[PDB]
Amino acid sequence: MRILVLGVGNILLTDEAIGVRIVEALEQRYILPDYVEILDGGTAGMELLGDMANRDHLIIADAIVSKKNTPGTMMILRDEEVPALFTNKISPHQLGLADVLSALRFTGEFPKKLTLVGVIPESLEPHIGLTPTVEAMIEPALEQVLAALRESGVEAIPRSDS
Structure with a gap:
């Protein structure tokens, strides 16, 4: 194993900060085994060309910005679906993530x-914050970053507090 958990989005565009808030809130609540870097990629998109490379398993957390589906809803996309999702021209950093x-x-x-x-x-x-609608989405997304880690059998420990 070698894992990155990469938060992305605009730290200036309300809810778009969510991908970053997920990884900040993971660091401050869960100790990980050594081989799981949490990393903020604040506004980057394109710069992550080198960082996202050669990792064995990569969990991105991001704002999707658009579909015909309800505010605050979660989507999970797996390997093949993710580049296809980010073809969406409405999602600016995500077009560079593509x-x-x-x-x-x-x-x-x-x-x-x-x-x-x-x-x-x-x-x-x-402006900065999440909406209340998406502040609530931090923890369902923690549970899905934690579920994604558990797909490889990686348990993570709440504060190493037990």
Whole structure:
């Protein structure tokens, strides 16, 4: 195993901060085994070309920004579905995340198991916070980053507090 848990989105666009808030809230609630970096990728998208590479299993957490589906809803997409989802031109950083998934496929340094714990926003406007609708989504997404870790048998320990 070698795992990244990568938070992404705009830390300025209300709910778009959710992908980052997931990984901040994971660090502050769960100790992980050594081989699980939590990493904030604040506003990057494209820069992560090198970081997302060569990892065995990568859990992204992000804002999906758009579908015809209700605010605050969760979607889980697995390896093949994730580049396809991020073809969405309405999702700005995510379009560069799509070209990271292009470039990882171009090198072949694409993971064994990409997973995306992705969240629909509510307001997505230039102020900071989540909406209440998406503040609530931190913990269902923690439970799905934790479920995704458990797909590889990686248990994680609440604060190492027991």
